[PDB]
Amino acid sequence: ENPIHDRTSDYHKYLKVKQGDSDLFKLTVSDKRYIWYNPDPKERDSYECGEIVSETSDSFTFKTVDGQDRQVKKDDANQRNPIKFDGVEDMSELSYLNEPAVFHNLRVRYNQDLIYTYSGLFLVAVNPFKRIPIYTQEMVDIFKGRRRNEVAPHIFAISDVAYRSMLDDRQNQSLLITGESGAGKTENTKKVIQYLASVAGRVLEQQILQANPILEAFGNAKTTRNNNSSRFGKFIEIQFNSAGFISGASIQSYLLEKSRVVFQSETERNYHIFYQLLAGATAEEKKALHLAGPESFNYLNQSGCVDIKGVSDSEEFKITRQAMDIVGFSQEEQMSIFKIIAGILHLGNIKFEKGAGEGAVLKDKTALNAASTVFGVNPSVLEKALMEPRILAGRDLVAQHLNVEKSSSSRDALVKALYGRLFLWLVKKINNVLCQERKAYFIGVLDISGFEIFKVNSFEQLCINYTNEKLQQFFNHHMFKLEQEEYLKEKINWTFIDFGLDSQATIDLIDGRQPPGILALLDEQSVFPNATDNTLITKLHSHFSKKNAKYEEPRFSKTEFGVTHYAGQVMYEIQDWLEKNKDPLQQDLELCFKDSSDNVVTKLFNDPNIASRAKKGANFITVAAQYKEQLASLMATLEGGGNPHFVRCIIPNNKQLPAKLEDKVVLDQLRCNGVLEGIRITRKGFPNRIIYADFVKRYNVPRDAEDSQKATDAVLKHLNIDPEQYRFGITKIFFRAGQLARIEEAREQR
């Protein structure tokens, strides 16, 4: 009748704790007390359960699994919770809050394939690495309209709360999904969009859903940490009208890792689309675009990996096209896109060799010709733009003759420019389909590239990790600093707590303007004509080595520097940072391609939104300077809207495998995310607070008395409730954890 109360239901099967049996009940009513302890003290995250057998005034004595006795100061003891709590849906409710206790609860739920658990006001999501049947339309219909208490933890539930808050307060909402690479941010992002598309839907809705398949084909790739890594960040606005139904959507993408098109580490892959087309193209297309297998192209055959376990690139290519068909990309538009993808691969097979002099020559023109043909440009113009670009020397026109290395770098620069502009064009084309009505409100979903560490971390990794560092500070800001400052404002005689979670020092080291940080010193070096990679790291060491605690000059290298992030220390290799920040492209290469006969290619080099570049003084804006501002604008939106809804995505292990929840990996993320601290603030504080005059409004009789703090003093007193669970502020009635949601449902039943 109602699937929630029906133990036969799929909702009870896949989203509720299984019923315990008679044997477990006898354990549950037992009076024995237990403790989480470390059998091996060096391994501080590995725990066993031990029974407390005696206690002194200041310590517990307990029995290990093997039978030996041990003591522990009660101040240092991690008590196990009464097992009745095992599986609790909100860990606010736990009696003992400690790392082994919190981890254990998630383990119990994970083992039953319950990946969602609440931690007070935010949702925790552990990556299952297997399909779970909790995202059907049936499950959507169940969560539709239900308040957070009534239903089990689900991404739908927090999406619904954000949707109801948008309309109850007439304010834009932010759903921010944190996590390191592979933790599940993109999967959950898509579930949020699925839910709101049906709950407030009315082909627009089909098209919204088809956008992300397109961008994942061109923006996602296999890394060592995730087989479907997002190599670009995205803020997605879901837009609604004043009535509350979907009006449209816009996507704001950030920092495509276009360097991946020309280089990939061992075991990795280029962007999916390359493998999709060559695998799934018709015989006409393969000849039209001079295609081959991935082993035939240098951009696809140097990593040693061309396929992903459990993925058919031939089938994904069918999926990719259908999404383009539904969104409205024409047949010749799509063919122009594939011509570009094809041309990039051919450009990469060009082999520059040494000529009679140091200047480079091109003895085989088979790749250049195939590229020129598909792009629709003059091969000899292109050839001369690659190896003989014209520059100005003062005002004089002088033709370079580049060597093999610099000819190869310019060709790479062209390839990364073509791919990044194609990606920006896809986003823009899509936004114009999905945005045809002035919004009334929106819910903005943030899905960034998550924290990652590799053997070699470069400029791209610092920008990625810096963004992850800023979102964590945003979480710290709202849960700890803003929460308490509202308490202080209302004079509830709360004395401040230091939760020891501040990412700001690391943030300032990266992006401070004065004292100038890494990104400022980078910019300075990028416009100085005698600068090199080694004058840059020398400058970074002098400013920060042994002067900033978040910075390390390593003793084992002369090209690496270490940044201590919330998620751990990262060591960055400085090679090529100047060129990556400047993002140069020979103008002769640009001139060649604006004469292209392909209408998509000509748009990528003539549309000023895609092709032109902002000047900050005498030079072009750098990549660092632009992105920093792009992100600052995004942060302004998030802080300007309603309070953010947080989903902390958690990776169970580093092997991308199901049913292996590892203790060290999980507790690392729980500590640096500030989960336990986020629980503590909810328990020790007053999360639910209400304006006096309208508490009576929603629930000597109650309503519109001259002053309601006098009234509610009476309402609560006459009523059956303790006065430690509320506090009288200047303008609000603060409530302790749970009181409001606990009580008013008796008002819902009365």
Ligand SMILES: OC[C@H]1O[C@H](O)[C@H](O)[C@@H](O)[C@@H]1O
């Ligand atoms: O929350 C109380 C419920 O009943 C009433 O109809 C309210 O107006 C509506 O907001 C909700 O459906």
Ligand SMILES: [Mg+2]
């Ligand atoms: Mg992702």
